[PDB]
Amino acid sequence: APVRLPFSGFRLQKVLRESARDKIIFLHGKVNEASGDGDGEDAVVILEKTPFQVEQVAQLLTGSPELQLQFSNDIYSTYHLFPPRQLNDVKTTVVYPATEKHLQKYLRQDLRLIRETGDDYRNITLPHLESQSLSIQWVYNILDKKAEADRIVFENPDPSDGFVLIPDLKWNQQQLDDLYLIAICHRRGIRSLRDLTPEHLPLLRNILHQGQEAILQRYRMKGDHLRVYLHYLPSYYHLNVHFTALGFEAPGSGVERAHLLAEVIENLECDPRHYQQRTLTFALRADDPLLKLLQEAQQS
Amino acid sequence: VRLPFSGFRLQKVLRESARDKIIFLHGKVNEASGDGDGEDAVVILEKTPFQVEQVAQLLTGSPELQLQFSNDIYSTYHLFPPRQLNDVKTTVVYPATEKHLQKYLRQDLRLIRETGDDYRNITLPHLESQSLSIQWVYNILDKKAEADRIVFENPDPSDGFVLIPDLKWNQQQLDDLYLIAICHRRGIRSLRDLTPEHLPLLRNILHQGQEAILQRYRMKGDHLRVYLHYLPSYYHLNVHFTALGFEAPGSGVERAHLLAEVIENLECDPRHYQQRTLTFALRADDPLLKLLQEAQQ
Ligand SMILES: C[n+]1cn([C@@H]2O[C@H](COP(=O)(O)OP(=O)(O)OP(=O)(O)OC[C@H]3O[C@@H](n4cnc5c(N)ncnc54)[C@H](O)[C@@H]3O)[C@@H](O)[C@H]2O)c2nc(N)[nH]c(=O)c21
Ligand SMILES: C[n+]1cn([C@@H]2O[C@H](COP(=O)(O)OP(=O)(O)OP(=O)(O)OC[C@H]3O[C@@H](n4cnc5c(N)ncnc54)[C@H](O)[C@@H]3O)[C@@H](O)[C@H]2O)c2nc(N)[nH]c(=O)c21
Ligand SMILES: [Y+3]
Ligand SMILES: [Y+3]
Ligand SMILES: [Y+3]
Numbered sequence: 133a134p135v136r137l138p139f140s141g142f143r144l145q146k147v148l149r150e151s152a153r154d155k156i157i158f159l160h161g162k163v164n165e166a167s168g169d170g171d172g173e174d175a176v177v178i179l180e181k182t183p184f185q186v187e188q189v190a191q192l193l194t195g196s197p198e199l200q201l202q203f204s205n206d207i208y209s210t211y212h213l214f215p216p217r218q219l220n221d222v223k224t225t226v227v228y229p230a231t232e233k234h235l236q237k238y239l240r241q242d243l244r245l246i247r248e249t250g251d252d253y254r255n256i257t258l259p260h261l262e263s264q265s266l267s268i269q270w271v272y273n274i275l276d277k278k279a280e281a282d283r284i285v286f287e288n289p290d291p292s293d294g295f296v297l298i299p300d301l302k303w304n305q306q307q308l309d310d311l312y313l314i315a316i317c318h319r320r321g322i323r324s325l326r327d328l329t330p331e332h333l334p335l336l337r338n339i340l341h342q343g344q345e346a347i348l349q350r351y352r353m354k355g356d357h358l359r360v361y362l363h364y365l366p367s368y369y370h371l372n373v374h375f376t377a378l379g380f381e382a383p384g385s386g387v388e389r390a391h392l393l394a395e396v397i398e399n400l401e402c403d404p405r406h407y408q409q410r411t412l413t414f415a416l417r418a419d420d421p422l423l424k425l426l427q428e429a430q431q432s
Numbered sequence: 433v434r435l436p437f438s439g440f441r442l443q444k445v446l447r448e449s450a451r452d453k454i455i456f457l458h459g460k461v462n463e464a465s466g467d468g469d470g471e472d473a474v475v476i477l478e479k480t481p482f483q484v485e486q487v488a489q490l491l492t493g494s495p496e497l498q499l500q501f502s503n504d505i506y507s508t509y510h511l512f513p514p515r516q517l518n519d520v521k522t523t524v525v526y527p528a529t530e531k532h533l534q535k536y537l538r539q540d541l542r543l544i545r546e547t548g549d550d551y552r553n554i555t556l557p558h559l560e561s562q563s564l565s566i567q568w569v570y571n572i573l574d575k576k577a578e579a580d581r582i583v584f585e586n587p588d589p590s591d592g593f594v595l596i597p598d599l600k601w602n603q604q605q606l607d608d609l610y611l612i613a614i615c616h617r618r619g620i621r622s623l624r625d626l627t628p629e630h631l632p633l634l635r636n637i638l639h640q641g642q643e644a645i646l647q648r649y650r651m652k653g654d655h656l657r658v659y660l661h662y663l664p665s666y667y668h669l670n671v672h673f674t675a676l677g678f679e680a681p682g683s684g685v686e687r688a689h690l691l692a693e694v695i696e697n698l699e700c701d702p703r704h705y706q707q708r709t710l711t712f713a714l715r716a717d718d719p720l721l722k723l724l725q726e727a728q729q
Contacts (some may be wrong), residue, residue, distance in 0.1 A: 134496035138507060142491040144484075152481035155453050159487065179487060179511070181479035183450035186442065186457070193440035193459065193475055199522070201433065209436065211521040213477070220518045222511040222662055224497060229505060243676050244654040247692070270504040279503035301508060304500060310450035356543045358687055378541055378686070378713060381451040386679065387659055387688035394545060402708075403701075410700075413690055415676060 138228055139163035139175055148176070148238040152427060154383070155181035159239045163228065175228040176238060182221045183310050192219065205315060223304045233266055236365065236417075243415040245388065246426050250409045253326055256425050261323070261369065268370045271316050274298060285313060286346030293334045294318040297343050300374070308351055311358075311377040315339045323369040324364055325391060328400065328407045336397045339373045347375060361390045365414050388415050436526045437461035437473060446474070446536040453479035456536040461526065474525040474532050484516055511680055513619050523721060538709035539715035543686065544724050548707045551624050554727050559621070559667060560721050566668045568594045569614050572596060583611065591632040592616045598672070606649060609679060611673040620669035623662045623710070628702045631695065637671050645673065659688040663712050686713050 142161035148205035149158045158178045165172035192215055203210040227234050228319040248257060257264075274296055288294035295317045298304050303312040315337055322328070326338075344355040359376045363384060366372065373393055383388060399406045416423040439461055458475050462471035492512055497509035525532050527671040546555060571577030578596055586592035593615040597603055601610040615633055620626070623717055626634075642653040657674050663683060664670060674680040682688065697704045714721040 134508075135499050136494055136496065137491075138502075140494070142488075144488045144491075147484055150482070150484075153452065155479045155481050157482040157487060158640070159484075159491070161491065177491060179482055181453050181482075183453055184448070184455045184477060184479075186445055186448075186455060189455065189457065190442040190459070193435070196434065199433070207525055209524050209526075211435075211522040211524070213520040214515055214518055217512055217522060219520075220512050222513055222517070224509040224511040226507045226509070227433060227505055228507075241677070245656070245676060247655070267504070270506055273503050280501055283501065292537075301503075301506060303509065304508070309448065309449075320524075358543070359684070361685060375463070377450075378543055379448075379450075381449065381681070381684065383451070384681075385684050386657075387683055387685050387690055388657060390685035392685055394709075394711060398709065408645060411693075411696065412694065425629060426484065 137163075137177075138226060139173070140167075141172070142167055142175065142177065143172075147420050148235065149240055156177065160230070160235055160238075170205055173228070174230045174235065175226060176230040176234055177225075178225040178238075180223040180225075182304060183307060184219070184221050185307050188219055192216070221304070221306065225301065231266075237266075242418045244418055244423055245413060245415050246423060247411050247430075248426060249411045249430075251293050252426055252429055253412075256429055257422065258326075260422055260425065264365060265369045266367055268368050271368060271370045271372075274316060275318060285350055286342065288318075288338050288342055290318060290338075292319050293338055295335070295339050295343075295373075297346055297375075308353060309377060310380045310382075311347070311351060311353060311375070312380070312382060313343075313347065313375040315343050315373040315375065317372075320370070322371040324371065325364045325396070325412070326407055328396065329369070330400050330404045333397065336393060336400070340393050340397065343375055353377070359385060360393045361385070362393060362396065363389050364391060364412050365389075365416075388413060436524060437471065439463050440473070440475070440518075441470070443472075444537075446533065447538040458528070458533055458536075471526070472528045474523075474528045474536060476523040476536075478521040478523075480519045480521060482517065490517065493573070501659070513565045517711045539717050541713040542716060542721055543711065543713055544721065545709050545711050546724060547709045548726060550724060551706075551710075554723050555720065556624075558723060562719070563667050564665060566666055568667065569668045569670075572614060573616060575576075584640065586636060586640055587616065588636075590617045591636045593637055593641075593671075595635070595641060595673075606651065607675060608678045608680075609645075609649065609651070609673070609675040611641075611645070613641055613671040613673065613678055615669050618668070622659055622664050622669065623694070623705055625669070626694065626698065626705050628698050631698055634691065634695050638695065641671070641673060649670070651675075657683060657688075658691040659683070660691065660694065661687055662689055662710055663687075663714070686711060 141163050146160045148160055156432045161175050162172045163175045198214040261428050286297040295315045297315045300312040300314045347353050357378050359378045362373055440459040443458045443460055448455040459473050460470040460474045473536040497511050581596050584595040593613045595613045598610040598612045646649050655676050657676050659672055
């Protein structure tokens, strides 16, 4: 049974970002303006066209689809096709109320690479963590069974070595070509890859092996069909591991941000302090203050 | 008006990309019309980008939505918009030939984690038996080919290399900038052949490579993603230079290795690349895949 936007009104302020290639758009709207003091609140609405489901496509092209002809020559031709309802799903995400840090992160990527030494991390990044980081209340809600409980795909309930595996916010669950799940560990205070030590190895292995095994049993998808990894920098500073279909070229799966869990585990087995000592490469917005901070602790 | 045929029986998904919301289908058409004898068609379908004004308008009309879930300030929904947002770009090849089929066909991939042993016992023996030609490299290195496009060359036979646009780039804009660097010293097959003796070749590549791109394109190093493939397609060490902003195919973690961390990895673990297990993806029909899977069963 269908619902409405969790707010009234939406008046466009700004296209934070759009991409014709990815068929996606992120908008900052003013909402609820006809109440209280008349200023309203900020929201972000994100609209993404969805992947095709080949069977519905094959069934459509078997009949007489609604078409207009755009180019014609001999054996080539391009139409505009207007499918029935069922092929038109647009994946819609709402952030509301949206904070100033949301508005910043969803804006116009003009990105710069940076190489962060262990020392740059203790000295510069760590003490500046608040400014990179978003509320993890949603993570607590899942771990506490207050949101998304009926979506949980698997749980290892151990307080220390356990975790919850659930469909990622980006996956609309309608097909397996873009399978995307997330594992969040039960244990609090592991912010990111920089916190990881051999003490976490049991936790890591369980995410890797019981996560893959749970995906094999739920979706029949084999581990050699999965790309399993973490982000550095993450947006939410509670360790989280991303399980994607390998043939899905997921945004954020690039060598400049993604780290395979299998390698992370073996890195720890070979090199207990590897994540505190070594240098990690990632991208930051041009104008992000932390970039400036870091550029200045290494140039001179 | 109409599709150029009647009936569609799916024969094969030649290629798909959920990320780009595109599929390439081969179907059999006309099987319940004319003589009864079906033909070949390719039909490519692609979702369209949004238009701001149509989206704004839809949103201020407060539409109805099917809730997927909510959590705190977050929520997601299925939206079934009115016709004007729903257009699909439908390209048809009819009748299509076996050439059209081969043009669009892509193999599905499979992950493998190749130990240092796996590489010694299985991949290396396989690759000396079977490899794609590295002539085209040779042609460049010794000026018979593409000398009209060199961006930079350091000639030192032991640590030098030539830097040319990759064929993937039409050179009309810097958005999708892509270059390869091929080294002068011969027989470096891939990453698996790298040791601390390579440190000058590597350093060389990264550093003079960036300087060349700076002077030629006005593009700073922090704007560049620089890396090698494992497994490469061509077994003569080759370094890839792409614009940071360009989400280049093949820059995924399951394939790409940052040049600079390959360097530091040599510095702290001299045997790294002969001992450590490396991860990569193979085509479903690659004989190497069956070999590795059989060795690890
Ligand atoms: C709030 N939240 C985030 N995730 C998922 O948790 C992971 C956190 O992962 P991470 O810490 O490594 O950070 P990441 O940067 O990947 O997450 P973010 O959500 O900021 O995604 C990165 C970028 O991808 C882009 N993007 C494409 N679609 C969306 C979308 N729908 N929402 C936000 N960003 C999107 C944005 O440009 C964004 O900055 C992400 O994969 C996110 O979908 C959630 N999953 C559930 N199940 N319930 C949640 O409530 C939830
Ligand atoms: C022949 N050639 C190739 N390159 C470029 O050299 C680099 C070699 O780099 P690499 O050794 O690590 O190989 P990579 O795997 O990147 O090569 P490429 O993208 O071309 O892969 C090879 C081929 O296999 C095909 N292919 C890739 N995946 C699939 C799949 N999944 N299914 C079916 N076919 C696939 C490709 O379309 C292509 O024909 C590539 O980035 C390539 O564009 C060249 N550059 C110049 N300047 N002059 C050349 O003549 C030249
Ligand atoms: Y006020
Ligand atoms: Y006011
Ligand atoms: Y079915």
